[PDB]
Structure formats: structure tokens, C-alpha cells
């Protein structure tokens, strides 16, 4: 027999029951089937989405975001069946204490990930429009994959406190609760103070890092590209800027600090390095303006020492043998790893015609706007109530109000993992089209 000190919120919660002192648990079977089907749908929907985007669809930077975005929701749908079991038993956790920490961590892991990814998506789209020269040279899929790995690492780092402060608390009804045990580790001299501060520190930091700050970034980046496209379209209407390429002064200001701007686009800096190298100077001067700019992109992507490694490729550009140079370039490590930023360069050497990067409209815009809309509507009410239960430590009157909505708005955030794969299809015709392809392919395994 062991006794653990609890918060006044949990202590008041460990005696809540309809019938006075009994072990008979009332069961809401309507919610069991609801979350049961939600568990089934979530696993199947995100299951096929991962397959479609990840195997049948051509891999891009944007699809990589969506891929991980649907990966986090897959895990959220993997812990959900254990929440169904929780309801089926009668709101009691009967699967140990460590598993309680894991199951809970998946919820917050999904939360932070979905908040960090949606931030990454907005920032990526921001760099695509605001920083065209940098984006066309460094926005490779390999980079986008490494970003996600950092985001997951930061996500699991912010779910550790939740993993730690999760515990099994016995009710008087025989029920076993799985919730916040703030006082589980290092209780201060003032229990009521360390109970309030830690709960507030959790609810607030969660609200910021996984909701307010993302929505701030999303709304702020959305305004950046809107003004940029307006100023860009104004430049496009000008007759003199018909054949111009690699602009930087779209953001206004001056070119005095181009070598210091994050996400660098300093074209002049690259040119000075080209004229300095013995293997690049005679090749640069022999090229026309369109092909000279394509050479600047190569030293942007792999440096000047990297482009000087292609001896009998510069030998080809110097002799204006474009096609035979194209063959040699497309058979390298540089093209094999990052084909999209490479092919755009090679074709320029081939045709001598500039293909504008800031000309290409953004993709999955309908998708992200929908996913963002759902994210704000499903995690919205949650953070509201969760901030109120941290507020309810001081105000006991809010405690009954919390448990009239918190179980609802929490399951509302759970259903965000079910909504997204549907939203993927409804806003992305290619994704839906690619799905009905494989759907028809498998169904044709009867003939
Ligand atoms: C309300 C809730 C949260 C919110 C949070 O932990 O901040 C949460 C996070 C991860 C997984 N589930 C969660 N549930 C649902 C839940 C959890 C515990 C209990 S209890 C106190 O009976 O053990 C009830 C409920 C619910 F409200 F859904 F019934
Ligand atoms: C129905 C429940 C089970 C769900 C099964 C999930 C199906 C997985 C689908 C294919 C994943 C293929 C991954 C290929 C993408 C590679 C990109 C990367 O390495 O991150």
C-alpha cells in the first residue's frame, strides 16, 4: 500500500461519480463505437495516403511535408484504439503505467509535429516566393527530409515533460485514471504553488509552441507572399523586364548587405569567384547572358570548387557542345541526388532559354489552407479548455466547467487525424486521381 500526494484538481476528480460509492461503471457505448470507427478510419485513411503520396506519386518538397503530416496522424490513429478500450471499460486505464505514458505521449507528439510541420510548410512557401534565387538552388527534397527529421526530434523533445508527468491514479470507484501527475517528480516545499506553476507552464507553453506561434507564422507568412506576388505582378506588367532573370531587389531596400542576408542570393559574390578561378573564367566569358546565369546557379548549389571538378563538361560548354555536355552532366552525382535543381540548369545550357522559377505558381495551396483551417478548429477549443484547467487550480468554480467540454474538445483534436486525409483528396485533384488509379489497379486483380 502506497500513498501519493496529488493536486486539488485530481483529488477532487478522484471522487467524482454518479452513484454514491460503488464499483459499477456506467458505459457510453455510443462513444466507444464512435472512437472505434474513428480508430479504424484513421488507420486506413492515413495508411493509403502514405502509400499514394509516398510510392505512386512523384516525390517533391511539398509532398514530403504532407507525407510526414500524414505520418503523425497515423500514430495518432494508432494510440486511439487504446482510448476506445479506455471508454469500453468505463473510463479506466487498465494497461499499466508505462504504457499510459506512451499512449499519452503519442497525442502530444502528434500535436507538436502537426504544429511544427504546418509552420515549416508556411515558411517553405514563404521562401519560395520571397527568396526565389535561394529557393531554386537549395530547396531540394533531401533538404526537406532532413528538416522533418529535426522537427520530429524537436517534437519528441517537447513531449518528454508530458511523458514524465503522466501517471496512473486510482479513483475511489476502483477506476484507474491516466492523467497529469504534476507532483510525481520533485515536489517543492509549497505543493499548491508547484502544482499551479507547472500546470500553467505546461498549458501555456503548449498553447504557444503548438498553436499560437504556428498560427502566427502561418498568418505572417501568408501576408508576406501576398504583398510579394502583388509587387512581382507589377514588375511583370513592365515591358522592359521581359527577358530579365534572377532578381533580388523585389524585397526593396538596397544591395549593400546581399552577402549577409540569410538565405543568400548574392549573385555578384558568385561572379567574382568565377572570374577568380582558372577553370571558370574562360568558360564564363564564352557563354551568353542566359547561360552565364545558369553557371551562377551551379556555384550556388555546389560551390566553385565543385563546378570546377567537371573538367570535360566545361570543355563542352566552352566549345558550345550543349547536348554532349547535357549527357555528361546528367550522369553525375549532382544530378542523381538533386535532379530538379540540376535539370533546370542543364536545359538552360541546352536551349539557351531561361526558365523562370518565380513564374511557376505554388502547389498544394488549396491543401494547406484546408489543413490549416482544420488545425485551428480542432486544436482551437482544446487549448482554450486546457488553459482553463490550469486556471482552475486557483478558481475551483471552473473545474466543473472544464469536464463538461474537455473530454469533447480532446476527442475533437483526435478527429483531426481523420479529417486531414479526406481534406487531402478534396483539395488535391492529383492526389485523388492517383488514388483512384491504384484503387482501380487492385480491383482489377480479379480478372
Ligand atoms: C482530456 C484528455 C487529454 C488532455 C490533456 O492531457 O491535456 C488527453 C491527452 C492524451 C490522451 N487523452 C487525453 N484526454 C482524454 C482523457 C484522459 C484522461 C481521462 S481520466 C481523468 O478519466 O483518466 C479522461 C479523458 C476524457 F476526458 F477523454 F475522458
Ligand atoms: C492500414 C493500416 C496500416 C498502414 C500501413 C501504412 C502504409 C505505408 C505506405 C508506404 C510507405 C512508403 C514510404 C516511401 C516514402 C519514402 C520517404 C521517406 O523515406 O521518408
The reply to whether 233 falls in a domain is no
Q: How many domains does the chain have?
A: 2
Instruction: Read off the CATH number of the domain in which 140 is found.
Output: 1.20.1070.10
Do 260 and 219 reside in the same domain of the chain? Answer: no
**Residue 146: alpha-carbon gap to chain centroid:** 12
The reply to whether 3 falls in a domain is no
300 C-alpha to ligand 2 centroid (Å)? 33
Going by CA atoms, what residue is nearest to atom 20 of ligand 1? 177
Return the best residue to mutate from 39, 43, 47, 60 for the ligand 2 pocket (most ligand atoms within 8 A of CB): 47
Do 189 and 74 reside in the same domain of the chain? Answer: yes
The reply to whether 239 falls in a domain is no
Going by CA atoms, what residue is nearest to atom 14 of ligand 2? 54
155 C-alpha to ligand 2 centroid (Å)? 20
Could you give the CA distance from residue 211 to residue 116 in angstroms, rounded to a whole number? 9
- Shortest-distance ligand to the CA of residue 54: 2
Do 79 and 13 reside in the same domain of the chain? Answer: yes
Resolution stated for this PDB structure, in Å: 2.8
Q: Which of 328, 351, 374 is the last residue of a domain?
A: 351
Q: Are 77 and 160 in contact (CB under 8 A)?
A: no
Q: Which of 351, 386, 412 is the last residue of a domain?
A: 351
179 C-alpha to ligand 1 centroid (Å)? 6
Q: Which domain holds residue 14?
A: 8-19+26-225+365-443
Could you give the CA distance from residue 221 to residue 83 in angstroms, rounded to a whole number? 36
Do 347 and 373 reside in the same domain of the chain? Answer: no
Q: Which residues line ligand 1 (CB under 6 A)?
A: 13, 91, 104, 107, 177-179, 386, 406-407, 410
Do 269 and 213 reside in the same domain of the chain? Answer: no
Q: Which of 351, 381, 409 is the last residue of a domain?
A: 351
The reply to whether 320 falls in a domain is yes
Going by CA atoms, what residue is nearest to atom 20 of ligand 2? 145
End-to-end distance of the chain based on CA atoms, in angstroms?
65
- Name the method of structure determination: X-ray
Cα 64-66-70 angle, rounded to 5 deg: 120
Catalogue the active-site residues. 250
The reply to whether 306 falls in a domain is yes
The reply to whether 414 falls in a domain is yes
Do 250 and 203 reside in the same domain of the chain? Answer: no
Q: How many CB atoms lie within 10 A of CB 143?
A: 14
- Over the Cα atoms of the chain, what is R_g? 28
Instruction: Read off the CATH number of the domain in which 334 is found.
Output: 1.10.530.40
Could you give the CA distance from residue 114 to residue 382 in angstroms, rounded to a whole number? 14
338-376 per-residue burial string, b: 16 or more CB within 10 A, e: under 16:
beebbebbbbbbeeeebbebbeeeebbeebbebbbebbe
Could you give the CA distance from residue 257 to residue 267 in angstroms, rounded to a whole number? 12
Do 71 and 193 reside in the same domain of the chain? Answer: yes
Do 341 and 370 reside in the same domain of the chain? Answer: no
Q: Are 299 and 273 in contact (CB under 8 A)?
A: yes
Do 307 and 379 reside in the same domain of the chain? Answer: no
34 C-alpha to ligand 2 centroid (Å)? 26
Q: How many CB atoms lie within 10 A of CB 118?
A: 22
The reply to whether 418 falls in a domain is yes
Do 176 and 270 reside in the same domain of the chain? Answer: no
Do 280 and 406 reside in the same domain of the chain? Answer: no
Do 255 and 218 reside in the same domain of the chain? Answer: no
The reply to whether 187 falls in a domain is yes
- Shortest-distance ligand to the CA of residue 9: 1
- Shortest-distance ligand to the CA of residue 382: 1
Residue carrying the nine cell digits 474538445: 409
Main-chain dihedrals φ then ψ at residue 431, nearest 5 degrees = -65, -40
Amino acid at each position: 500500500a502506497t500513498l501519493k500526494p496529488l493536486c486539488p484538481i485530481l483529488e477532487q476528480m478522484s471522487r467524482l461519480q454518479s452513484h454514491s460509492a460503488t464499483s459499477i461503471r456506467y458505459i457510453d457505448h455510443a462513444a466507444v463505437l464512435l472512437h472505434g470507427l474513428a480508430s479504424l478510419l484513421g488507420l486506413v485513411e492515413n495508411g493509403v495516403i502514405l502509400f499514394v503520396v509516398g510510392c505512386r506519386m512523384r516525390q517533391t518538397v511539398v509532398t514530403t511535408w504532407v507525407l510526414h503530416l500524414a505520418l503523425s496522424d497515423l500514430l495518432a490513429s494508432a494510440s486511439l484504439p487504446f482510448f476506445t478500450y479506455f471508454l469500453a471499460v468505463g473510463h479506466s486505464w487498465e494497461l499499466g503505467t508505462t504504457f499510459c505514458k506512451l499512449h499519452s505521449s503519442i497525442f502530444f507528439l502528434n500535436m507538436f509535429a502537426s504544429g511544427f510541420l504546418l509552420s515549416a510548410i508556411s515558411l517553405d512557401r514563404c521562401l519560395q516566393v520571397v527568396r526565389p534565387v535561394w529557393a531554386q538552388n537549395h530547396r531540394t527534397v533531401a533538404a526537406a527530409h532532413k528538416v522533418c527529421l529535426v522537427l520530429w526530434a524537436l517534437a519528441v523533445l517537447n513531449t518528454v515533460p508530458y511523458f514524465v508527468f503522466r501517471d496512473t491514479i486510482s479513483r475511489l470507484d476502483g477506476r484507474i485514471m491516466c492523467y497529469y501527475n504534476v507532483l510525481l517528480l520533485n515536489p517543492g516545499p509549497d505543493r499548491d504553488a508547484t502544482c499551479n506553476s507547472r500546470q500553467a507552464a505546461l498549458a501555456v507553453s503548449k498553447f504557444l509552441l503548438a498553436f499560437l506561434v504556428p498560427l502566427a507564422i502561418i498568418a505572417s507568412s501568408h501576408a508576406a507572399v501576398s504583398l510579394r506576388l502583388q509587387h512581382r505582378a507589377d514588375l511583370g506588367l513592365q515591358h522592359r523586364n521581359i527577358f530579365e532573370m534572377l532578381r533580388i531587389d523585389e524585397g526593396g531596400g538596397s544591395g549593400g548587405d546581399e552577402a549577409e542576408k540569410l538565405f543568400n542570393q548574392d549573385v555578384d559574390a558568385a561572379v567574382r569567384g568565377i572570374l577568380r578561378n582558372a577553370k571558370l573564367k574562360p568558360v564564363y566569358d564564352s557563354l551568353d547572358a542566359v547561360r552565364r546565369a545558369a553557371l551562377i546557379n551551379m556555384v550556388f548549389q555546389m560551390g566553385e570548387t565543385g563546378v570546377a571538378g567537371f573538367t570535360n563538361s566545361l570543355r563542352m560548354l566552352q566549345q558550345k557542345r550543349w547536348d554532349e555536355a547535357a549527357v555528361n552532366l546528367a550522369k553525375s552525382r549532382w544530378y542523381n541526388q538533386t535532379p530538379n535543381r540540376a535539370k533546370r540548369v542543364i536545359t538552360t545550357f541546352r536551349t539557351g532559354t531561361w526558365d523562370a522559377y518565380r513564374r511557376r505558381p505554388g502547389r498544394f495551396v488549396r491543401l494547406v489552407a484546408a489543413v490549416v483551417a482544420a488545425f485551428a478548429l480542432c486544436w482551437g477549443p482544446y487549448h482554450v479548455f486546457s488553459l482553463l484547467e490550469a486556471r482552475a487550480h486557483a478558481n475551483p468554480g471552473l473545474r466543473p466547467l472544464v469536464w463538461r467540454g474537455l473530454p469533447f474538445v480532446t476527442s475533437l483534436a483526435f478527429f483531426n487525424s481523420v479529417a486531414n486525409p479526406v481534406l487531402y483528396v478534396l483539395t488535391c485533384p492529383d492526389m485523388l486521381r492517383k488514388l483512384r488509379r491504384s484503387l482501380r489497379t487492385v480491383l482489377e486483380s480479379v480478372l
